[PDB]
């Protein structure tokens, strides 16, 4: 009778220097064509790792196609992106940099930008052995930093570890309903999700104008239409709005929809209130580190093109 | 012992908690209508306090009218903004929040946004005795945070304080050229500028397509046309491009232009490189603090409007 959910464990970077280099790159807006957009712009670590809007604002204020997921605990995902088209964090990181709808630069340009700065070259030398800058090393460093973005210490985890007073009566009943109703069928493990692909709209379809088809984009099979990676519910309190289209503005709405179309279960108001209370106890310790200080661009650095 | 420039000294917040609150607000993108733009977006503290582009990107990617100045050491300015229309940091902070070309929100909405969060209400109470949030308290807190954004410790300051080795041969000669040519007429004091309004184009006009008129926008006196607050040269190495229109991409170009139109001095390539070397020794210790962790928006919080 072991719990369907396990505590998140603290992480010690295999390569501290690499994680520091990755941190810097994650906050460097010069990886973008505009010199205005960094990974942190859309995955704000001061706010829970997302941009907290329906879909992401990209280069020249392009309205993105889908809701940006949190990077927090993303190292635990079975694959990356809503349709899992990316195998891991490293592969994922190369995407946004060259995505015309997001950072809109190119791997070639990103390499030249970083390499133009002596302070970055020195770090690549320390970390990789030589001062050569490549998108491969860049994504490897960012990935290492993201591995450290886990959030242990949530009240629920403290309860799981034996602290009976970490949860109040409503929160405990919420968890019991979460488990008893069937939510754990898909939202389980340390991340309370992120370990499989499931249909969004089991008993009834999810109503949305958003055209995303999920896994079908990868397989082309009709059976995969509307099948997405199950999101982690850790820090769900900080990652509103909800669902891939950002269609559910509140947790209550997300829970009611989930109960209704995934379990054919209409929760009453108090039941929803208790589950939501439980979900908020899944918020863990947020990133704790100094604001990164980045090296200045110099006369050799390709200049930003915010309006060009 | 009587150099025209004096060292910058560390600043301990009169109210530590107030500065901590100001720090959180400075990094909060919810002060903007889009929920995507914070003070840090255009005054990036990881990069030197500016956005490092010709003019600022505002709501819906509006191309701003003028180059964004650095907030670093801004507490030393005789007034705020290129035309000095704002008397101090407190007064200045109210501008961007309600500027349709920048954050595009309103003072009323920002107050409602911040007050909707218990975590913020609690901080305002421990700071101002009361838990109610007003644009007055918001700007007071931000200004307090900005008072701490001074940058002591630059190599030049170490030199002024006794370390004869803090500067190399070229850097020292550069300083001597700076002092001996007439530059300290306008760039002096602890901020190496910021203490007066001066004409941009003393001997010859500064060519630019930018329509900014400077002090005339405030005084209406034709005599004040093209008269601006002299920018601080502290951390000038980190705040490219240069001048109010962002027209000079390099320090070499900026120095050459300044000598020509301000002093009627034509510096040869060697002299320019030495002055540039000196300017870089004005880069001080950058902000050293933990990345702010902000409270989550809740069901009572006005929702971000990035596209509507
Ligand atoms: C907005 C303009 C973005 C920028 C800049 C970056 N990311 Fe992002 N990211 C964004 C979206 C809309 C999505 C989902 C896209 C999809 O097709 O599903 C993502 C996804 C990720 C993920 C996947 C996490 C998951 O649970 O699936 C990761 C790990 C991630 N993003 C990391 C990341 C990094 C490191 C970035 C900078 C190099 C970066 N993103 C920029 C939107 C935006
Ligand atoms: C599989 C059959 C699921 C069951 C059972 C439950 N959930 Fe779920 N959930 C699942 C998926 C595939 C998704 C993403 C759907 C999409 O296209 O957006 C979700 C998402 C949520 C969310 C939002 C997460 C986010 O947007 O980041 C919440 C809050 C959530 N699910 C809660 C939840 C609860 C409380 C459940 C039972 C009542 C439940 N889910 C069951 C897949 C499945
Ligand atoms: C970009 C869209 C901006 C945002 C967001 C904020 N600021 Fe800004 N700031 C910007 C510009 C283009 C200018 C100059 C405007 C002019 O007419 O001169 C400024 C100026 C300041 C200053 C004055 C510094 C000086 O004159 O030397 C300060 C102190 C400053 N800005 C602070 C500040 C704060 C605290 C913000 C958020 C509430 C903020 N700015 C946002 C562009 C942008
Ligand atoms: C007043 C009569 C000045 C003298 C003498 C010098 N400078 Fe200056 N400088 C002055 C102003 C009013 C401005 C802003 C002009 C504008 O409209 O943009 C500046 C700016 C600079 C800068 C750029 C600062 C920035 O963009 O933030 C630099 C690097 C600079 N000045 C250097 C400099 C040097 C080396 C001088 C002597 C050769 C010099 N200035 C003289 C006003 C005055
Ligand atoms: Ca979300
Ligand atoms: Ca500048
Ligand atoms: Ca010039
Ligand atoms: Mg020009």
Swiss-Prot record, chains A, B:
GO MF term set: cytochrome-c peroxidase activity; electron transfer activity; heme binding; metal ion binding
Claim: Aminoacyl-tRNA synthetase is one of the keywords in the record: no
Species lineage: Bacteria, Pseudomonadati, Pseudomonadota, Betaproteobacteria, Nitrosomonadales
Annotated binding of heme c 2, by residue: 183, 186-187, 258
InterPro entries (UniProt xref): Cyt_c-like_dom, Cyt_c-like_dom_sf, Cytochrome_c_Peroxidase/MauG, Di-haem_cyt_c_peroxidsae, MauG/Cytc_peroxidase
PTM field: Binds 2 heme c groups covalently per subunit.
Record's compositionally biased regions (Polar residues): 296-308
Stretches for region Disordered: 289-308
Keywords carried by this UniProt record: Electron transport, Heme, Iron, Metal-binding, Oxidoreductase, Periplasm, Peroxidase, Repeat, Signal, Transport
Taxonomy, superkingdom: Bacteria
Enzyme Commission number: 1.11.1.5
Main location per the UniProt record: periplasm
Residues noted as binding heme c 1 in the record, renumbered to the chain: 39, 42-43, 244
Catalyzed reactions per annotation: 2 Fe(II)-[cytochrome c] + H2O2 + 2 H(+) = 2 Fe(III)-[cytochrome c] + 2 H2O
One GO cellular component, as annotated: periplasmic space
Protein's UniProt name: Cytochrome c551 peroxidase
Protein location: Periplasm
């Amino acid at each position: 009778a072991n719990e369907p959910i396990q505590p998140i464990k603290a992480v010690t970077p295999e390569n501290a220097d690499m994680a520091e280099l990755g941190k810097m790159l994650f906050f460097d807006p010069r990886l973008s064509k505009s010199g205005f957009i960094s990974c942190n712009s859309c995955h704000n670590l001061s706010m829970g790792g997302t941009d907290n809007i329906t879909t992401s604002i990209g280069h020249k204020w392009q309205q993105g196609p889908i809701n940006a997921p949190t990077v927090l605990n993303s190292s635990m995902n079975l694959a990356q992106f809503w349709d899992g088209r990316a195998k891991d964090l490293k592969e994922q990181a190369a995407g946004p940099i060259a995505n015309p709808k997001e950072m809109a630069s190119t791997h070639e340009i990103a390499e030249k930008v970083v390499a133009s700065m002596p302070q970055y070259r020195e770090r690549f030398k320390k970390v990789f052995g030589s001062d050569e800058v490549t998108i491969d090393r860049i994504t490897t460093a960012i990935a290492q930093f993201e591995e450290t973005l886990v959030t242990p210490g949530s009240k629920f985890d403290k309860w799981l570890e034996g602290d009976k007073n970490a949860l109040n009566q409503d929160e405990l009943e919420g968890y019991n309903l979460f488990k008893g109703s069937g939510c754990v069928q898909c939202h389980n493990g340390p991340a309370v999700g992120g370990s499989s692909y499931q249909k969004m709209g089991v008993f009834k379809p999810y109503e949305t104008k958003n055209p995303a088809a999920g896994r079908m984009d990868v397989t082309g099979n009709e059976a995969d239409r509307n099948v997405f990676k199950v999101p982690t519910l850790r820090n769900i309190e900080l990652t509103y709005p909800y669902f891939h289209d950002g269609g559910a503005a509140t947790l209550e709405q997300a829970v009611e929809t989930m109960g209704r179309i995934q379990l054919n279960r209409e929760f009453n108001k108090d039941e929803v209130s208790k589950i939501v209370a439980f979900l908020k106890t899944l918020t863990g310790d947020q990133p704790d580190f100094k604001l990164p200080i980045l090296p200045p661009s110099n006369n050799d650095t390709p200049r930003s093109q915010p309006y060009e």
